[PDB]
């Protein structure tokens, strides 16, 4: 399965690997291959409870006093 000189963190620390950069580019073209908004709604359409705590309706006023 090929060789692997030096540590991984170091082997890469010196400089990004071509293979890595390649994969990255692929993903970019993947998502870009199709619209974002269009797919956004299309995906959500699937059954997975889109509610999610009513869009996270957590409390949060402020709470801060300093006078008397």
């Amino acid at each position: 399965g090929a060789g692997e000189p030096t540590t991984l963190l170091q082997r890469l620390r010196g400089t990004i690997s071509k293979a890595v950069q390649n994969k990255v580019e692929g993903i970019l073209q993947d998502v870009q291959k199709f619209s974002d908004n269009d797919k956004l709604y299309l995906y959500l359409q699937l059954p997975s409870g889109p509610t999610t705590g009513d869009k996270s309706s957590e409390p949060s006023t402020l709470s801060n006093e300093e006078y008397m």
Binding site: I16, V20, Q21, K23, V24, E25, I27, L28, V31, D36, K39, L40, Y43
Partner: protein, 62 residues
């Protein structure tokens, strides 16, 4: 555990590396749907912010 508050980079300038990296960060576990939309959304708001550049050559005080 969380990285200290170090001011350096900024939410802008979309790039391949910054993509895979920032993606994983938001991924958390391994959600392709989220990392996908989020990645795109981030890139959008990224370009929006950060206005044009200028000269800015002050010279006062010590």
């Amino acid at each position: 555990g969380h990285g200290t508050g170090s001011f350096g980079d900024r939410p802008a300038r979309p790039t391949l590396l910054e993509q895979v990296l920032n993606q994983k960060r938001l991924s958390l576990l391994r959600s392709p749907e989220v990392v996908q939309f989020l990645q795109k959304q981030q890139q959008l708001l990224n370009q929006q912010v950060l206005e044009q550049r200028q000269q800015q050559f002050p010279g006062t005080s010590m």
